[PDB]
Design a protein around this ligand. Structure first.
Ligand SMILES: CCCCCCCCCCCCCCCCCC(=O)OC[C@H](CO[C@@H]1O[C@H](CO[C@@H]2O[C@H](CO)[C@H](O)[C@H](O)[C@H]2O)[C@H](O)[C@H](O)[C@H]1O)OC(=O)CCCCCCCCCCCCCCCCC
Ligand SMILES: CCCCCCCCCCCCCCCCCC(=O)OC[C@H](CO[C@@H]1O[C@H](CO[C@H]2O[C@H](CO)[C@H](O)[C@H](O)[C@H]2O)[C@H](O)[C@H](O)[C@H]1O)OC(=O)CCCCCCCCCCCCCCCCC
Ligand SMILES: CCCCCCCCCCCCCCCCCC(=O)OC[C@H](CO[C@@H]1O[C@H](CO[C@H]2O[C@H](CO)[C@H](O)[C@H](O)[C@H]2O)[C@H](O)[C@H](O)[C@H]1O)OC(=O)CCCCCCCCCCCCCCCCC
Ligand SMILES: CCCCCCCCCCCCCCCCCC(=O)OC[C@H](CO[C@@H]1O[C@H](CO[C@H]2O[C@H](CO)[C@H](O)[C@H](O)[C@H]2O)[C@H](O)[C@H](O)[C@H]1O)OC(=O)CCCCCCCCCCCCCCCCC
Ligand code: CLA
Ligand code: CLA
Ligand code: CLA
Ligand code: CLA
Ligand SMILES: CCCCCCCCCCCCCCCCCC(=O)OC[C@H](CO[C@@H]1O[C@H](CO)[C@H](O)[C@H](O)[C@H]1O)OC(=O)CCCCCCCCCCCCCCCCC
Ligand SMILES: CCCCCCCCCCCCO[C@@H]1O[C@H](CO)[C@@H](O[C@H]2O[C@H](CO)[C@@H](O)[C@H](O)[C@H]2O)[C@H](O)[C@H]1O
Ligand SMILES: CCNc1nc(NC(C)(C)C)nc(SC)n1
Ligand code: OEC
Ligand SMILES: [Ca+2]
Lengths: 341, 447, 82, 335, 35, 137
């Protein structure tokens, strides 16, 4: 009909790599995000930013490389290539960690585009959008952790830097400063991811070892009817198995599969809320009743008190080279340490 | 001959389950790869080997195996002649070509099956006798081998005895413990702290002695199987098939793999700290030795020193009363070692010997072993995870122990997997539930 | 089971393909190589050369300390180097 | 009586039992009841345990000041190391509870039973005519409990270094582990998180794809679940519509159409990944730790140029330097 | 069939294909820098 | 920011006279220092006796002075206690005891000079790091 419907027509055309309206947002961003990372990983440094070598060009390996956050001076600045900081200049932008907000913000839109895609492709193919609902979980994580979090802190500098090792310190930090492992929400988080990776494994095996024989071969893979018809595995046998070994067992594939969506998506949602709270530093650091008894009574010791001391050490020995902008100077005598070590 | 209408590509080797001949090429070609390695690696080690430097500081794991059998070494594990190393290496490397020949031959030219090209070699998995017999042949070959060691030790040269009276040295064992009460005693030993089971072997007589028993006991069973068939239970108990037999041998290796991991990690005797590194406990012990030795020279009375907790900076007591080194090292009070024994009394570390019988060679032994504990990183950076780069080293004992726990493990999975397959294969459902006769459907509802 | 695109398999096998890419691929490679080896990359990304982290004596870090006059501050850091 | 024992064996092995007490079960059921019963009592009323062998009792039970999150069953003493400490090895229970005896009684019975639990996951599959291997999936989580409760202690020389039985006690095991082994920088742990992250990921993929491509048979105001009856002949979702959507999300050949290959992958991934994670802990149990890139990148003069690998080392030193305050008397931590 | 050349798939394939090799080339070169 | 010959100029003897090492000797020392020292002196400390380090000042107050090529060299041949009132060649690697510490057999006067030079050059580059321990890592 008209240019719009013709533009549409073209886009929604069934190619090898479906484009679609969504693609107009997805691909530009998704590629820029992936690109910026791959660029910084090998070329840009984090010297003027964290006093750290962070690229292959400097000597870092796939584990130690990363696109480090901007200085703490920048604050929450969007750090646009043409903004007050970089001032249109590219190299400076690079040295001021412009590549972080670049990857961050771009990838962010890229996750919007992608979920939209699922939504758009779902609609076309005429299937229900539970693949999109599910993907809300990963959005929440990215949003709360790479955006909401540092937005509550002093600046982007405390957001997780893009890189393998550069993420491990994000972990260690959270233990040491937020005592994050003791947080009810992080726990739910893991219960879901850990519990989700169980349903995955357990359901898979239950199916492969509860299959009907539809072939004469040993390699039963070929024996499958790509064109529906009968259930390829004995749902009835599976039920009896677990009902006798675990005591409880599914018996409604519709529920067994919905459950599998729920468990890990709910888990990640919870782990997000916990972090949205760590933004304001509203952590789950201590148990007051415990601290009070530990003060008055020097012989009371739990695996909890023990941990808190591990945190003190993490904070004292890391803070210096981890928060350069604070020009920390901790005399050897002030550094907490046990005996001998 | 055999393609996809046998098994899937990635399960290819199972297409040889019933082609005795070709299934022989595999085993003969494979056994070639092991000799090839053993040989080719030894020369690699020797090519890098530096005489005047610890073996453990050179990433060696074969030369130290030869050294233990008393070859190219002398007083204290000093390397004398590198020839036996070069020899053992090249010889194997050659035999690899011979075997490899046969393998390739039997797998792509010779008979694809054996039963007809000679009924002696051809075989039938369910042939309880052929099986019991071939097993019997191998049970003898292994038995001779066990004696091949007893010989090298008693007649041909000896073995490296670190406990050597005059101090570590190659010694000829001419008095193997044959007393069954003792030999087999080991098997009745706890596998926990202190009583360590097999790994507690601590002198060459038992090693040699015990191997004498195994060699005989082994060949004896080799003849017995040659001359027999499984009884009744032996038959109503096991599964008789190509896979089932495999499985049984899989679980067997797994177990030997775990036992080996602990031997190289704990044992001091058959794994001399002189060629490998100091044991885990041995190194923690040496730190205590080192500092009790140091501070004592500065005028400290080790016997009465009180540490932060009020337990005893240098010396404390174990749960059953014996005097041991203090500190976290209290967990390794079961460590025994040439260098440290002369300080032990009838009640454990003697405060008088510690006070004036410590010898320099011991002080530097303790120092050496202290600074060569089995702590290191994947990229080989010796020390604690927080250490700095410089000393490129990872104890041979760490390498061996980890590699073999992984292998030992996966093999236990291998066992479960091939055993699970064999039981379903036998009864016959390893390809799916009979759409028609679905067993579960004939059973009452537990409800 | 199909769309317009010419089945990769066919292309990765066409002698035309290799006749084209045997030229193109190494082309791109040698280019990037030179990008690094000519020191150009260092300037495109303000990344320090092994001899440009600190001034000879100084052992302090060139930490950018304020957003707006950042670029200016960075430039001055390059001034001590040499 | 067709023969008592003959009968017994028919019951035990009976596939008509609500819960299949198998042959492996005969060992499982008792060991697991002991482990469970001892734990629950311990966790609630056990008194302080001198975990580090330095006479500095760590109380970890509810009645002694702990809450669910902090409370735990504390590991046997370090004075004990790897020695066997059965109740009949103590002058009294008072002595046994002080040296952390309950810990061993629990870990040993649990590990024992949890293995038979695997042996059972095979047996029932056999008595039911289904293919084995499910028990092989369960070998991963088991191989972990083993690594964390036995291998690591054997390797380290003491049961006091095994993972405690409690929430916070576990975080302790982790935080310290990291300090002494730098696990986050080890290939095996990474494969572990790939498997776990991936699992949860895939678990969500499958779960959604399927649930979203279900054939309509339900009302607008009726649980979409009822559209399935236990004991159906044909499938309850359009696996061809599922593949149709997912193939377009990414691209066709990068999408499953074979339910069997889908489900194998679904099981293979996590199990394989966790297998490596378990081998990681079992490997770092002999001190072959993660990559140590401390002071790798250095400049033209020799100055040390830090990488994130170094910022990680500081955080590790803090842990090293503060764990086990009073347990060390010497320079190097070789235990 | 009479398949075309420059297609949408082609574009994509190159957006990732081209840069990659350019990087693999860059990196391969770094392996020789020193001090 | 480089290892100039200006940095490789370290005191040769007690009477102020100096010597200038070359980037070859340096690297060579560094390699030798790893081959026969790191084991116990990694990063300038001393694992089997943390009280004595290789910090130049520590070596300055040693007895005799061991903060110059001549000094360290003598030491690597005939080692003594910090007051020099006792020879320790029996429990410390040295030339007069290579039979006991093989790693010291190859070592020739050329090598001893490099190792010595490294010890005086390192702190010049690393500074506080060289002496202190984990606190500075
Ligand atoms: C469901 C199915 C799942 C399937 C999963 C399959 C997973 C398969 C994992 C397979 C293999 C893991 C292999 C590990 C190899 C380790 C090699 C190594 O340790 O090699 C060590 C060497 C050496 O490192 C070097 O170590 C060196 C020095 O040591 C020393 O050397 C110096 C002199 O040169 C001095 O003497 C010094 O004192 C001494 O200590 C230097 O420090 C170097 O600077 C340092 O770079 O390794 C290096 O450089 C290494 C750079 C390494 C990058 C490594 C990545 C490793 C694993 C990644 C897994 C990713 C998974 C992703 C999954 C995604 C989706 C599933
Ligand atoms: C599904 C989800 C899809 C998401 C898609 C997202 C797409 C784009 C996201 C864009 C994010 C922009 C963030 C802007 C920002 O951070 O902007 C930050 C600035 C405020 O900046 C801060 O200001 C601070 C200083 O305040 C102090 O100093 C000031 C003078 O400098 C004044 O004196 C002030 O009164 C005094 O308190 C510091 O300078 C900080 O360094 C500086 O970053 O403006 C402002 O935020 C205006 C903010 C509107 C915020 C909306 C927030 C939403 C969630 C927030 C959670 C917080 C926790
Ligand atoms: C793969 C696995 C491969 C295994 C391969 C081979 C194993 C061989 C074992 C031989 C064992 C003999 C024995 O064992 O004997 C075993 C003992 C009985 O032990 C002995 O008890 C003895 C002492 O009684 C006495 O000694 C005391 C002082 O020590 C007091 O004086 C006391 O009054 C006095 O009566 C000593 O304490 C011994 O040291 C102690 O070992 O119990 C025990 O082993 C209990 C063992 C429990 C194992 C629990 C495993 C849990 C999960 C396993 C998963 C495996 C896969
Ligand atoms: C349970 C736990 C089990 C743990 C087992 C751990 C290790 C088993 C190792 C076997 C190693 C053979 C290594 C080798 O030959 O190692 C060689 C080198 C060694 O480098 C050398 O390392 C040497 C030294 O080691 C040693 O030397 C030192 C003295 O120099 C000390 O003696 C020290 O203790 C000793 O170990 C020297 O430092 C050299 O200078 C240095 O160059 O490293 C390398 O090779 C690194 C190679 C990395 C390969 C990475 C592959 C990554 C991904 C593959 C994916 C396949 C996927 C298939 C998927 C299919 C379907 C999905
Ligand atoms: C490690 C040892 C090993 C061995 C000994 C074998 C042996 C064998 N395999 Mg496997 N296989 C292996 C590993 C191994 N395989 C692995 C890792 C995989 C997974 C990729 C497979 C997958 C597989 C499949 C899918 C199939 C086999 C089959 C076979 C048989 C094939 C006969 C044939 O067609 O020859 C063909 C041989 C050639 C074309 C050339 C090979 C030459 C080899 C022998 C040597 C190369 C070395 C060197 C050049 C020789 C120098 C020798 C020296 C003395 C001079 C044979 C007995 C087939 C079968 O089961 O049939 C019943 C089959 O279908 N295998
Ligand atoms: C590791 C096990 C192994 C086994 C079980 C076999 C088994 C067999 N082989 Mg091989 N073979 C092997 C390894 C093995 N081979 C290797 C490594 C090579 C390469 C060197 C060969 C090369 C080979 C060839 C070229 C031929 C066979 C043949 C045969 C079959 C002969 C049956 C027959 O008709 O009567 C023959 C009776 C015998 C072969 C037994 C006599 C063995 C004597 C000659 C040598 C024993 C070895 C050694 C010298 C003893 C140690 C002495 C000590 C002092 C050091 C038989 C099934 C033949 C065949 O295909 O038949 C159908 C054939 O032509 N094999
Ligand atoms: C090297 C491999 C090897 C292999 C594969 C076999 C295999 C076999 N042998 Mg044999 N044997 C061997 C070496 C070997 N033997 C040697 C060297 C000797 C000389 C002593 C013998 C002497 C021998 C005799 C005298 C007999 C067999 C028999 C049998 C068959 C027994 C079936 C059975 O139920 O066993 C499984 C064993 C059991 C079910 C018993 C349970 C024992 C419990 C108490 C402990 C199990 C171990 C424990 C859980 C962990 C280890 C503890 C540690 C302290 C040992 C079987 C096919 C029997 C047969 O029928 O021969 C024709 C028979 O009577 N063998
Ligand atoms: C000790 C002897 C042993 C023997 C003789 C066999 C023999 C056999 N196994 Mg088996 N297995 C073993 C141990 C053993 N296994 C162990 C310890 C495990 C636990 C992991 C398994 C797990 C296992 C499974 C899960 C399966 C088999 C299968 C099979 C059959 C496969 C046919 C084939 O084509 O190979 C296939 C070989 C390959 C496809 C090669 C790929 C190997 C990959 C997975 C790992 C490579 C590891 C290497 C170290 C990595 C280096 C990479 C490099 C780039 C650096 C065959 C009869 C298959 C079957 O159908 O059995 C009836 C099957 O599905 N096995
Ligand atoms: C084409 C389409 C591509 C689409 C998606 C691509 C995703 C690509 C990721 C690439 C990571 C590259 C890392 C790299 O190049 O490192 C290059 C580095 C740097 O190596 C270092 O280089 C320095 C100089 O720059 C010095 O020479 C150092 O000494 C040297 O160690 O990496 C390695 O050595 C890596 C070993 C990496 C093993 C990685 C496995 C990664 C698996 C990822 C996903 C698996 C499924
Ligand atoms: C294509 C999609 C683009 C999206 C945003 C593009 C923004 C471009 O913004 C524009 O970049 C050029 C450099 O290329 C800058 O030009 C500036 O940087 C260069 C270096 O790169 C300096 O030599 C120059 O003196 C300076 O003015 C402009 O000041 C800036 O306004
Ligand atoms: C049947 C729907 N297709 C499909 N494809 C894929 N492909 C990967 C690579 C994610 C396993 N996964 C799923 S969910 C297990 N489904
Ligand atoms: Mn619980 Ca492993 Mn840090 Mn020595 Mn104790
Ligand atoms: Ca230079």
């Amino acid at each position: 009909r008209g240019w719009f419907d013709i533009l549409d027509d073209w886009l929604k055309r069934d190619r090898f790599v479906f484009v679609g309206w969504s693609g107009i947002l997805l691909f530009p961003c998704a590629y820029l995000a992936l690109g910026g990372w791959l660029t910084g990983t090998t070329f840009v440094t984090s010297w003027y930013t964290h006093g750290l070598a962070s690229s292959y060009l400097e000597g870092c390996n796939f584990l130690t490389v990363a696109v480090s956050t901007p200085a703490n001076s920048m604050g929450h600045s969007l750090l646009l290539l043409w903004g007050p900081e970089a001032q249109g200049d590219f190299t400076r932008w690079c040295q001021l960690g412009g590549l972080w907000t670049f990857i961050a913000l771009h990838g962010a839109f890229g996750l919007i585009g992608f979920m939209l895609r699922q939504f758009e492709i779902a609609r076309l193919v005429g299937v229900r959008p539970y693949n999109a609902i599910a993907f809300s979980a990963p959005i929440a994580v990215f949003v709360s952790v790479f955006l909401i979090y540092p937005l509550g802190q002093s600046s982007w500098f405390f957001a997780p830097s893009f890189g393998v090792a550069a993420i491990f310190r994000f972990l260690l930090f959270f233990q040491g400063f937020h005592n994050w492992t003791l947080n009810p929400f992080h726990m739910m988080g893991v219960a879901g991811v850990l519990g989700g990776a169980l349903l995955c494994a357990i359901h898979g095996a239950t199916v492969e070892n509860t299959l009907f024989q539809d072939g004469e071969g040993a390699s039963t893979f070929r024996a499958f009817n790509p064109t529906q018809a009968e259930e390829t595995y004995s749902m009835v046998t599976a039920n009896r198995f677990w009902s006798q070994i675990f005591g409880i067992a599914f018996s409604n594939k519709r529920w067994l599969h919905f459950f599998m969506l729920f468990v890990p998506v709910t888990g990640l949602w919870m782990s997000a809320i916990g972090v949205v709270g760590l933004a304001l530093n509203l952590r789950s650091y201590d148990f007051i009743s415990q601290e009070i008894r530990a003060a008055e009574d020097p012989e009371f010791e739990t695996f909890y008190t023990k941990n808190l001391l591990l945190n003190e050490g993490i904070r004292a020995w890391m803070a210096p080279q981890d928060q350069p902008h604070e020009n920390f100077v901790f005399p050897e005598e002030v550094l907490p340490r046990g005996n001998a070590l | 001959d055999q393609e996809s209408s046998g098994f899937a590509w990635w399960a290819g080797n199972a297409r040889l389950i019933n082609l005795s001949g070709k299934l022989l090429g595999a085993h003969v070609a494979h056994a070639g790869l092991i000799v090839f390695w053993a040989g080719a690696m030894t020369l690699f080690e020797l090519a890098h080997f530096i005489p005047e430097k610890p073996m453990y500081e050179q990433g060696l794991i074969l030369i130290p195996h030869i050294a233990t059998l008393g070859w190219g070494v002398g007083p204290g594990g000093e390397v004398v002649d590198t020839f036996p190393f070069f020899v053992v290496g090249v010889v194997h490397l050659i035999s690899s070509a011979v075997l490899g020949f046969g393998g390739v031959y039997h797998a792509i030219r010779g008979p694809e099956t054996l039963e007809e090209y000679s009924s002696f070699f051809g075989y039938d998995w369910k042939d309880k006798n052929k099986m019991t017999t071939i097993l019997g042949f191998h049970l003898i070959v292994l038995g001779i081998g066990a004696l091949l060691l007893v010989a090298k030790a008693m007649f041909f040269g000896g073995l490296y005895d670190t406990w050597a009276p005059g101090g570590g040295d190659v010694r000829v064992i001419t008095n193997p413990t044959l007393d069954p009460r003792v030999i087999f005693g080991y098997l009745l030993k706890s596998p926990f702290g202190g009583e360590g089971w097999i790994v507690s072997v601590n002198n060459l007589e038992d090693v040699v002695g015990g191997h004498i028993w195994i060699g005989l006991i082994c060949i004896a069973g080799g003849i017995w199987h040659i001359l027999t068939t499984p009884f009744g239970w032996a038959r109503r108990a096991f599964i008789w098939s190509g896979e089932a037999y495999l499985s049984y041998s899989l679980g067997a290796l797994s177990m030997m793999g775990f036992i080996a991991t602990c031997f190289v990690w704990f044992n001091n005797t058959v794994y001399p700290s002189e060629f490998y590194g100091p044991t885990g406990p041995e190194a923690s012990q040496a730190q205590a030795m080192t500092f009790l030795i140091r501070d004592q020279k500065l005028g400290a009375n080790v016997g009465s020193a009180q540490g932060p907790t009020g337990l005893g900076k240098y010396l404390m007591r174990s749960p059953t009363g014996e005097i041991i080194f203090g500190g976290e090292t209290m967990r390794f009070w079961d460590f025994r070692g040439p260098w440290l024994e002369p300080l032990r009394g009838p009640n454990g570390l003697d405060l008088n010997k510690i006070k004036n019988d410590i010898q320099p060679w011991q002080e530097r032994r303790a120092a050496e072993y202290m600074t060569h504990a089995p702590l290191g990183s994947l990229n080989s950076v010796g020390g604690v995870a927080t250490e700095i780069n410089s000393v490129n080293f990872v104890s041979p004992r760490s390498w061996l122990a980890t590699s073999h726990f992984v292998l030992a493990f996966f093999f236990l999975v291998g066992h479960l997997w091939h055993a699970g397959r064999a039981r379903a294969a036998a009864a016959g459902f390893e390809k799916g539930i009979d759409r028609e006769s679905e067993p579960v459907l004939s059973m009452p509802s537990l409800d | 089971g199909t769309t317009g695109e010419r089945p990769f398999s066919d292309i990765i096998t066409s002698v035309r393909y290799w006749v084209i890419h045997s030229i193109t691929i190494p082309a791109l490679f040698i280019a990037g190589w030179l990008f690094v080896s000519t020191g150009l990359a260092y300037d495109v990304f303000g990344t320090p050369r092994p001899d440009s982290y600190y001034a000879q004596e100084q052992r302090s870090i060139p930490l950018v300390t304020d957003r707006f006059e950042a670029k200016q501050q960075v430039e001055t850091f390059l001034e001590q180097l040499k | 009586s067709a023969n008592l024992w003959e009968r017994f064996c028919n019951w035990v092995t009976s596939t008509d039992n609500r819960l299949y007490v198998g042959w492996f079960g005969v060992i499982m059921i008792p060991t697991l009841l002991a482990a469970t019963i001892c734990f629950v009592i311990a966790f609630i009323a056990a008194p302080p345990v001198d975990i580090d062998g330095i006479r500095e009792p760590v109380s970890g039970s509810l009645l002694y000041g702990n809450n669910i999150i902090t409370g735990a069953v504390v590991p046997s003493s370090n004075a004990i190391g790897l020695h066997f400490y059965p109740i009949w090895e103590a002058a009294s229970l008072d002595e046994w509870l002080y040296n952390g005896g309950p810990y061993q009684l629990i870990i040993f019975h649990f590990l024992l039973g949890a293995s038979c639990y695997m042996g059972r996951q095979w047996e029932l599959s056999y008595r039911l005519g289904m293919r084995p291997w499910i028990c092989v999936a369960y070998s991963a989580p088991l191989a972990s409990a083993f690594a964390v409760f036995l291998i690591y202690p054997i390797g380290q020389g003491s049961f006091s270094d095994g993972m405690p039985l409690g929430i916070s006690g576990t975080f302790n095991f982790m935080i310290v582990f990291q300090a002494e082994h730098n696990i986050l920088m080890h290939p095996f742990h990474q494969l572990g998180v790939a498997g776990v992250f991936g699992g949860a990921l895939f678990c969500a993929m499958h779960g959604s794809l399927v649930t979203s491509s279900l054939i309509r048979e339900t009302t607008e105001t009726e649980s979409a679940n009822y559209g399935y009856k236990f004991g159906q002949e044909e499938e309850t979702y359009n696996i061809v519509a599922a593949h149709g959507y997912f193939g377009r999300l990414i691209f066709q050949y990068a999408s499953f159409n074979n339910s069997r290959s889908l489900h194998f992958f679904l099981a293979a991934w996590p199990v394989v990944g966790v297998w490596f994670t378990a081998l990681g802990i079992s490997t770092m149990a002999f001190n072959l730790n993660g990559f140590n890139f401390n002071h790798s990148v250095i400049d033209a003069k020799g100055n040390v140029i830090n990488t994130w690998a170094d910022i990680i080392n500081r955080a590790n030193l803090g842990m090293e330097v503060m764990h086990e305050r009073n347990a060390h008397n010497f320079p190097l931590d070789l235990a | 069939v009479s398949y075309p050349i420059f297609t949408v798939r082609w574009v994509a394939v190159h957006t990732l294909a081209v840069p990659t090799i350019f990087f693999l080339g860059a990196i391969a070169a770094m392996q020789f820098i020193q001090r | 920011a480089e290892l100039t010959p200006e940095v490789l100029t370290v005191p040769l003897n007690s009477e102020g006279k100096t010597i200038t090492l070359t980037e070859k000797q340096y690297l060579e020392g560094k390699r030798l220092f790893q081959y026969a020292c790191a084991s116990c002196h990694v990063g300038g400390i001393t694992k089997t006796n943390p009280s004595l380090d290789l910090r130049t000042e520590t070596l300055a107050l040693a007895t005799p002075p061991r903060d110059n090529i001549e000094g360290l060299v003598d030491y690597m041949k005939n080692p003594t206690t910090y007051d020099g009132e006792q020879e320790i060649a029996e429990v410390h690697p040295s030339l007069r005891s290579a039979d006991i510490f093989p790693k010291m057999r190859n070592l020739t006067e050329k090598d001893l000079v490099a190792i010595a030079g490294h010890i005086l050059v390192e702190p010049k580059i690393l500074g506080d790091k060289w002496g202190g321990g984990k606190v500075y890592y």
